[PDB]
Structures are given as C-alpha cells and as structure tokens.
C-alpha cells in the first residue's frame, strides 16, 4: 500500500535495517551494485553478492525481506555485533567490499564518486611563518550537537579555528614551541553526503553511555557553499534532505527507524523494520528534532547531481546472469 517493502527484524540488528534502506534508495549505488561480476563468488561469504540479493529482494519481494545471509557474510552474526559498532562503521564495511569488488570492472570508482569528499586540516603558527597542511579524504562527517542549535551551528564549530597557546603550543620542530591555530576546511562535498550527529557520549565516570536528547534542527534544503573553500558558481553546494535515521529512547531503551523520500519529491514514508507506512513531512523532519525521539544520522544529496543519483532503476538494469543465480537460490529454499 506504499510501493516499498520492509526488512525483517531477525533479532537485534539496530541501525542496519535503516542503513540498508538508505543505500538501497541510493539508486546510482543500487544500479552499480547490480553490475558487479559475482557469478563465481561463494554465497556463504560473499557480501557483494549478499548485498545484491537484499537489493533485488527489496525491489521485487511483496513480503518482508530477510538479512540473515547478509549478516553472516561480513561476520556480524552475533546479536551483540551491531551494538558494538556505530552506524558509520557498518556503512564503511559495506562500501569497502563493493568498491574492492568493483576494482578492474566497468563500474570502478563508483563509491568515491558518490560518497568521497576532500578535506584539509591545517596548523598555522602565529609568530613564525610555518604551516603544516594535511590533505585527507572522508566518506562521512561527524557533527557535534551539544550546545548547537541547528546544522548551521554544527558546521561552523567544525571549521572554527582552535588556539594552540599556553602550555599547548604547537611543536614546530626547528622553530620550537610556537603559538598556533589549528583548523579544518572543506575542499569538495560528495554528491551523497552522510552526516552522523553525535547524539551519544560515554563518560568514563559512570560505566554507561548518555544520550543527547537536546533539540537539533536540520533543513529540508541545506546550502553548504559558505563552508566550501574556493566556492565555484554554476554548481552550488545546495543539498536536499533524502534520509533521516531516527533513534528513540534513552540510555537503555532504543528503537531504530528511518524516514525517506524515495524519489526526492518530498513524499515521505516511515520504515519501521517490516512496517512501511506513509507519513507527513513534519513527522519525518520537524518531529525528529528532539527536546525522546530524535535523529542520529542524515543523508543529503546534491541538487545538481540529484537526478543521476536518484535515477529510476528498472528490471533491465539487473544482469540476467545475476538474476538467474538469485532465482536459482530462491528455488532451493523452497
């Protein structure tokens, strides 16, 4: 009654069902995942093949979709495995294996094209003229929310310059200890932007976590051109909200649900494991600010690359050798 099918809750997988729906509706990722040459892989341990089955089943099955063979493929069959990892770690586990499988084939370099961005982090001396530039990549950004009112205020805190004065002077080597300024600047933003909000904190005093249920606002449209170093016209960093991963509860109780507008048209649905239901745009955006139910991860897509990232995926996009192998497997289950 929604056009989309859900995922089974086969124990305690937490954020995994929410993450699989996010990656499955990254249509450029989905079509590229179908392209992987996996005819000769082992179904017991091949997670690229395992991800294809889940994607094919999410596209065709009328019944809730199973993930048992997928969890077994990357070694997280223990029910504690998902509680002992963050949502970004799981995504890196999936993306690393599909990108390594894409090496040497026609869909090589997909993962860097969608999710990779370029970041610089510097240290600039105040007295002497020494600067240590450091260029590195990212596939996801961790934002601080405690004290910060909205996504605007978390991005300014991410780039804010830190003063390395006092007994915290920077070791400039030959220049000796020097007062300095450390900071981070963004060079490029990826077409599909993964943003994890730090809604949880372990203090060492008491041996337990603590959830930030403070109110944190995020927009449907996020212009990030201000935070880009060397902004270019004709391609602003204007992003559109696609997914909002939601955790409700406290330090002990917790449920992981995701809201998504599939086609990018602002028509939202709630994906509660096996129950998919239409929902208002306010329930997916403004009801998840907090102040308890609130969001912990956000997925944005560049408006310029919006059309090709969310391109329609038809049955012809799935290779027939893959198709015949999955429909093979389906016949042996029965």
């Amino acid at each position: 009654h929604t056009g989309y099918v859900g995922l089974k809750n086969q124990g305690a997988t937490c954020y995994m069902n929410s993450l699989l729906q996010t990656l499955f509706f990254t249509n450029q990722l989905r079509k590229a995942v179908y392209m992987m040459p996996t005819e000769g892989d082992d179904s017991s341990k091949s997670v690229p093949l395992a991800l294809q089955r889940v994607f094919y089943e999410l596209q065709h099955s009328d019944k809730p979709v199973g993930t048992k063979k997928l969890t077994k493929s990357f070694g997280w069959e223990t029910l504690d495995s998902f509680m002992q990892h963050d949502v970004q770690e799981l995504c890196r586990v999936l993306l690393d294996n599909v990108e390594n499988k894409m090496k040497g084939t026609c869909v090589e370099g997909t993962i860097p094209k969608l999710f990779r961005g370029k970041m610089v982090s510097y240290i600039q001396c105040k007295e002497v003229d020494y600067r240590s530039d450091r260029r590195e990549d990212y596939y996801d950004i961790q934002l601080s929310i405690k004290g910060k009112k909205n996504i605007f205020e978390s991005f300014v805190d991410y780039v804010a310059v830190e003063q390395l004065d006092g007994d915290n002077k920077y070791d400039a080597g030959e220049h000796g200890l020097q007062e300095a300024e450390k900071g981070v600047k963004f060079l490029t933003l990826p077409p599909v932007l993964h943003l994890q909000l730090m809604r949880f904190m372990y203090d060492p005093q008491t041996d337990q976590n603590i959830k930030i249920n403070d109110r944190f606002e995020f927009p449907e449209q996020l212009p990030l051109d201000e935070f880009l170093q060397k902004t270019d016209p004709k391609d602003p960093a204007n992003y559109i909200l696609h997914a909002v991963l939601v955790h409700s509860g406290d330090n002990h109780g917790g449920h992981y649900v995701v809201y998504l507008n599939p086609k990018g048209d602002g028509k939202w649905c709630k994906f509660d494991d096996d129950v998919v239901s239409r929902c208002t745009k306010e329930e997916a955006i403004e009801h998840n600010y907090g102040g308890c139910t609130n969001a912990y991860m956000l997925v944005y897509i560049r408006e310029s690359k919006l059309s090709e990232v969310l391109q329609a995926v038809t049955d012809h996009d799935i290779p027939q050798q893959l198709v015949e192998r999955l429909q093979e497997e389906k016949r042996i289950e029965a």
Binding site: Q84, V87, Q88, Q142, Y202, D203, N209, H247, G254
Partner: peptide, 14 residues
C-alpha cells in the same frame, strides 16, 4: 572505553 567519546548510536564495548 576509557575516555570521553561520542557516537551516533548506543555503542557498547567488547
């Protein structure tokens, strides 16, 4: 864990 750390989910140790 043994220090002030943040996560996006309820991450526990092993």
């Amino acid at each position: 864990f043994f220090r002030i750390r943040y996560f996006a989910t309820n991450v526990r140790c092993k």
